[PDB]
Design a protein around this ligand. Sequence first.
Ligand SMILES: [Zn+2]
Length: 2031
Amino acid sequence: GMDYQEYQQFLARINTARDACVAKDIDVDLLMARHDYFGRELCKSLNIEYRNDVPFIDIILDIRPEVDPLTIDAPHITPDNYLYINNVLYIIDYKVSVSNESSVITYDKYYELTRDISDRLSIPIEIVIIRIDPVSRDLHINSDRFKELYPTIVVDINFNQFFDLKQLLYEKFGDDEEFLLKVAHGDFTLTAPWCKTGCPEFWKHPIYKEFKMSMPVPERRLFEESVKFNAYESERWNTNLVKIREYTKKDYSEHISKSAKNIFLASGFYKQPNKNEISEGWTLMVERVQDQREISKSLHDQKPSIHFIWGAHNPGNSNNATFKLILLSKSLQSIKGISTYTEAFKSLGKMMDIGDKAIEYEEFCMSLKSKARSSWKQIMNKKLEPKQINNALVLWEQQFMINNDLIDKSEKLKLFKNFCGIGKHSKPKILDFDDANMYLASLTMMEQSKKILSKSNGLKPDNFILNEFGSRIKDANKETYDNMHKIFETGYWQCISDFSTLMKNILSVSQYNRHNTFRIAMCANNNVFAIVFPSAATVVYSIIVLHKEEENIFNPGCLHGTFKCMNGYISISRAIRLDKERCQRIVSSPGLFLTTCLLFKHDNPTLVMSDIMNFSIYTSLSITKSVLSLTEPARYMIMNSLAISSNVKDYIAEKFSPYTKTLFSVYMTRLIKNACFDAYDQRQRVQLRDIYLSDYDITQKGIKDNRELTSIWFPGSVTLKEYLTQIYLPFYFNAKGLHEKHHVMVDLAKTILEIECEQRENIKEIWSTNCTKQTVNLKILIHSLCKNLLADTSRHNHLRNRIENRNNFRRSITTISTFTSSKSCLKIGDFRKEKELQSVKQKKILEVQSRKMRLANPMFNYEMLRNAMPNYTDYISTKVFDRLYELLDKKVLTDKPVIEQIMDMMIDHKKFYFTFFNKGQKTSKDREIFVGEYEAKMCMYAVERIAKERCKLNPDEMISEPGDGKLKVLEQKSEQEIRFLVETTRQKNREIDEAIEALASNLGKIEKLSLGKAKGLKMEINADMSKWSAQDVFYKYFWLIALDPILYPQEKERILYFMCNYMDKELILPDELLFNLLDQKVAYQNDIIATMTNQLNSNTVLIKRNWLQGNFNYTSSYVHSCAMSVYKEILKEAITLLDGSILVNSLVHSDDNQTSITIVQDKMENDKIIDFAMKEFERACLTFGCQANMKKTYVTNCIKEFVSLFNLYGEPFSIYGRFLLTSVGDCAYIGPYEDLASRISSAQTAIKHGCPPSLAWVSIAISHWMTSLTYNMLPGQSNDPIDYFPAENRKDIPIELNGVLDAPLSMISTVGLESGNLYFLIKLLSKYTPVMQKRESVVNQIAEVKNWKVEDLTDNEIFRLKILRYLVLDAGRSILTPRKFTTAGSLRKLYSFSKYQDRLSSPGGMVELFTYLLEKPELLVTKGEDMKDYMESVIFRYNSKRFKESLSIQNPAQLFIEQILFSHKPVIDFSGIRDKYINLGKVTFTEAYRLLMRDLSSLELTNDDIQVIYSYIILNDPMMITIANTHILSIYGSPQRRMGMSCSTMPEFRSPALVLRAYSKNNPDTEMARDLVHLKEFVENTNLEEKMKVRIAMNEAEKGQRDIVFELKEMTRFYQVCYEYVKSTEHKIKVFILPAKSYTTTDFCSLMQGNLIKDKEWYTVHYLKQILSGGHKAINATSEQNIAFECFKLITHFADSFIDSLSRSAFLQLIIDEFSYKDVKVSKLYDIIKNGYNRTDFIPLLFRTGDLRQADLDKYDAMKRILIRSLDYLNNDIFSLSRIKVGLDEFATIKKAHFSKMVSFEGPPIKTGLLDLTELMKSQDLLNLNYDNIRNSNLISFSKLICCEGSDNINDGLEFLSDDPMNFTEGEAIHSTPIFNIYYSKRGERHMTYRNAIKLLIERETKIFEEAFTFSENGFISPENLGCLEAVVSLIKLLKTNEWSTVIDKCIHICLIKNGMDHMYHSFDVPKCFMGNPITRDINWVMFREFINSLPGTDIPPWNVMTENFKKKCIALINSKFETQRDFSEFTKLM
RNA sequence: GCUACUAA
Ligand SMILES: [Zn+2]
């Protein structure tokens, strides 16, 4: 990026400097260094000459020197650069800054002065100031004339390297306040106050009394003093803040020492995990569980592991519906024996008989299905009636009627009372997992499963996934394709998939399942069936299977019993009562399952594939809560047990509680138990990779991947990365929303009331010194607040200004999202009236639904609560957008500034109320959400937001960093430590290491000195705080508001009052919880809920110290940061004692914490400091009121846990798996494209977090599978659109119609779904383009499109383009989307929806809205900027029936079934499809394909229509421009192993609602005026201004009068398509893990491309031309130049690196003339360099050719006193093209380029004795700049570099190679606790030249070739063998020159030239033996043939296989020559 | 609950 020379000198100046005024100048010099750097590279980007601080009076003299500068008055300014074209002078003053505030100042200053001579000379002078952003990198130019000149400018600039120097300078001097004084943009500017008057009540409040009670009396007054302090009044802002700092400095200075001095007190005794410590924990766990749960040893109490019973399919019987129905009927009737429900199952088969009348079932059912398939809506009013067939009364296809005559009254009861459990109505029941005869039973269940499921399907291993994605999986990694087959083949896959396909059909049936009906559900298996019994939503089902022989059935613990029938055996499973939410997951279980297996097995050959799948079905299908209780606690139980410092005992003895209800759970528990002990013995089995560090980051970082560790869930060995996956991944198998709300509300309530009681009874004291639970070290707090509050205001002065802007404090409440959102909200008051009326309605609807059930199968309160509970404070649920509307209409909210309204609300609202609703997430331990009043939301907003922008300043806080941005931060901080550790070790041990190499004589004396030295120590505290919210003093936060400098006194009074009320805040127990406790039935022994509510009197309990979970994150997080800031100071004083160095780095995120400590020792042992660090860690937490959970907290020597994002020893790594398990049931079930959109987004996310392409593609397959399974769009399904459309396969069917996503992953990762459309257009620009222009930019290939011929194209090719233009372009672009008939639902709670009723009811008032909205069309798309505007927007919104539904929650489970059932019904309205073709009702999916073709065939494809596609898609979006370029200019290079992974940021490829108001009326309300100009162009170029008006203007003559509906609906479309153009998208933080650091776009592109090709090897990427094009106005000049630079940089270095010094000019001269780099002649590139204005870059090149003149030297010398003859003399002994002396010791620079580019050279061969330097250029292996790599290289690699034309003495011929020394890589151990070797590049000695390397290679490798090709006991001598050699090398020329043969020839050649036998080799033709007659050149193939067989061969590596293949090839080939398949008639003609 | 008619 930047120059290396200036970096080194600026780094040294930071250490050299001591005083702040010296450090000041280093910051000033760094600005100019960046200033010129931007200018140097931009001048080449614009092709102009570079200049610096050139006077304006001289700039005119270049244009017109006839008038002298004295008489003509020119403005005396100092511009940077100038240009004169088109009779206009353009003045340049480039500058790099974040804001244009510094640019407009210099703009108007220049514009004013330049006008003095602008009218004097009558030549207009334009000011062109170019500014670039130093982080986001965006170009900003003010000149409009300059915009039209340069359409696109190349800006791949690097500031990343500049900020590295800034970090160093603001580290040493950043602590000193003398340096902070010098950096200022106003010193300190405090903005306008948010309030006018203070708060008197705050000083009176009893909580403020209680605050000062505990506090000491000097502190009491200080708090008074601090609040009343105004920062704007006193001379400086830090008057008070420093004053209170200096008071507490007595106790602080002492307490910092106190903690630090404990380093000597410590011992080598810390909570370390050990086999016994784990064992002890388990035993106390057993005791706990055996009390807390009812332990059972009986095998009848178990629950099903899986809720399914699979049995082998029967191919002998027919696979057809009607047949199976009767088959199961007779089968069920035929059941023989006696049980409980035997005669019940018997009659059920009897009630589904058809027999003779099989054909009547085929018709009757098809009529009913056809009746429903006609209508969009369901068939209402008409009564469904059954038809008597044999004994059964069929109601629908596979639906029957329960006939009360066919079953006994007693036998009907048995089935429903006992078996189905309809009418059945104290510890939990669990299985003893410590019983070996229970663990046995559990193991035998697995042994049983493996015995049956391992057996193959025997059916074709070809399903949609493999059929359509197999190709794209296989090419990524062939292993995974096979792995997939291995699964699909095995009964495992058929078992799950048939349960999936069966459940889909169980749900589909269960929807219309009545109370007098039992339904039958069949699957792809013709033995497996299911019976769905009447449900009293709840699905009641049994799996009924007809397995072959007895016990050829899989029972996981689900089966009721097997039964013998009259033909075979039939088994019926226990009645399962599951919920649709659970069942859904079972349907998507195969996708979950495949991923599980593939992820585990991936690239690990030691694992048993049949054992992975054996475990996987029991996970992917496990829907019980038994499993979650294992999967979650395991993650910590393993990691704790393999960490260094960690408390396992306590975690296993308290936090671990198995709920082993099922039988898999028992087996899985013991898998975990065992895995805990294996960890302890593997702690030291972890190794640390050899770190190849050579300045600016490291490649080959992180942990060593060694397969020495042991797996957890199955047998085999595993890698660390894989071990971690096996540890953490299990938890993501867990299922969401399993927690029954009835139980959650109780346990959530109980906990809050338990911890509040704790505080009420036990915790009384607030502050303390000894450090105790819920206590803060008040003196230490106040100081550490003061110190940080200073540094978080000194580093940014406008801090109060930044808060106002970024959080919209000044603007009206109606603008901020958090307030105008559709989130849940709590309303307080009295609703006893409507709450009673809303309840009794449902209590009647209860009886309504019961009355109807009494007729068919006779099986069978809010008033009470209010009457019973006296002190019941009444509340209600509402919406956040609705509350705002309510508070405005009743006028308490206004257009007053939101903060100004907040301040008043803090003092107005005095009592705060909060309610909780459960999340019920995948975790077994349930999480609560506290949601209270809207009034509260406003208060917390300010307090939290003020802390937000404060927290952002501190780099330690990470809640500030949105998205997965933390991952890179982990890395950047880990790398800083790995570097520091090395740097510091080399700085101390250098004195000792010198003596070691000196003596190494006797080695017995060396060990004495090698012991007594410095010792490295790294450690990471992977923390997790205990009860961050509940067990935390809220009183401490009062001080943060008090001490605050950027808060006014009248604000400070008001903030603290609200917080004073947030102590007397009440928790409302929601009614649903109170209803559970309403019906007593004997109360709880010790009822905590009743205790706190006084035997249930009030529904409110007061919560004090427990500030509610998530309400004060940032606030608490700043105090956390302040706490860890102390921990730093503690250790940093402790390590100065021992005399060494320490680097502590703390990452803070509310409750999740990570703190990395790196120490270089001298005195005491490493293990002492380990215990010391942990002591002060808890101390640091507890001195601030927070307590650290030592249970979950673990410490490693590498690993970093932080928010579950993991960084290893530099190498960042997340659990790629967790995101692949999302693409299964994560969608809103809207449409085929709409579903896939989010399912592929989940796959895109995996790639970010370092996922292999092979597995990435799997998710893409699964996603498609589920997507197509939802709407019956799979191959062979109903809506299968391959026959309906013209196409070969689903790759060619548009993804809008649902097909497959045919694109490269490197595109899908970037854009996705749209990629599939983009690839179909790039395919064309690689088919329908000529030989010229195709190799050039994409832009050029788009110009040729309008010169194509339409007739050339094919049916499919035409088909895409027609939809792509007439449909896709304008309409998340979908065409097919099913519409529903859903109802609005109950919207009574809403106030705002009532005001729509009143405006709809009263006549005229409706139209009045729409007529008002037409004069303000800004309020159709965006919400109002003012009260009325926002309010009336809310009412209009209700117009949409979709927005009315949006505020109601539909179950995705129910939504899923509704898209299956409504697929054969008319759902897609064609009206909205045909409208576009023209500019009936709903249409069925099948008909939608037909009716699309009837319209499509009519449309016309032109040479223009196609050119609109290539404009609107490619040429419009600068991103799509580059993506297409990257895939056309792509040149994939060297395949390499993924050694070093690094984090990389996604690059850039680039007023809202107020602008649209200035479009409605052209007058705005200055910068916003300029924004409308480009908006005018957008609407005029597309011409959508007229197109919209014409569409309305001709509709009023179509309809008749004035339709207000069309007046708006068409006007809204016009404003919504504006929104996307006007309101710009925020470039959110996206981090991709790549094989190296991506600085700029091009770098990112190359590394991204190469990461998503193969799994085993990543590839480095090249490009012919620049890929970064900006549009279709910008059509090469800037793409050419850089090629010339690359070329000559490459050549000069290749020449001075490898070619002999003596003959380097000749080489260059030969290369320049007859050669070409990247299809451009090197001469033309040289001419481009010579005609350029940066010749100073290529001084040594120009001198060597004789194209260097004095002007260049004079310029070069002026950039950073010379003569030509001086150079001519000086460089008489320096022979290099990359370097010439331009002084006494100053050499010239050529700037080295990478050597992976030399392949892009194409010229005639240059032969040098024997070597062909062209082939050395074209070589891959022999281009490394490492001596050892080339010395220890293969002869196969070198054998390409030989021609020799009969040379001699190989030693002589190698004279044309560099006899200059090469660079070797040396490595050394670092002497850390995690001991690793650093490897770096040295310069070797002298005898390490390129020649000697080649020679040593030749010698070593030829010796091995000789002994392999002896074929006798002689050698490479003895003509008896030379004859054999001649024979073997003869055939090689008379056969076929493939690739294997030629190598042998050239190797033999080499070997014979070496031995001095190259005076005959060239005169070696076929011997006399083989040649019958010498003259008559006849060949005896038979002889030759038998000669090849008669060759013995050798088995020495590496030639053993080489020779073997050669022989076979040559034999086969020879035999081929003979074998000529002649025509049968041919010979019959000749003779 | 969603639907169709009757009734206050
Ligand atoms: Zn030769």
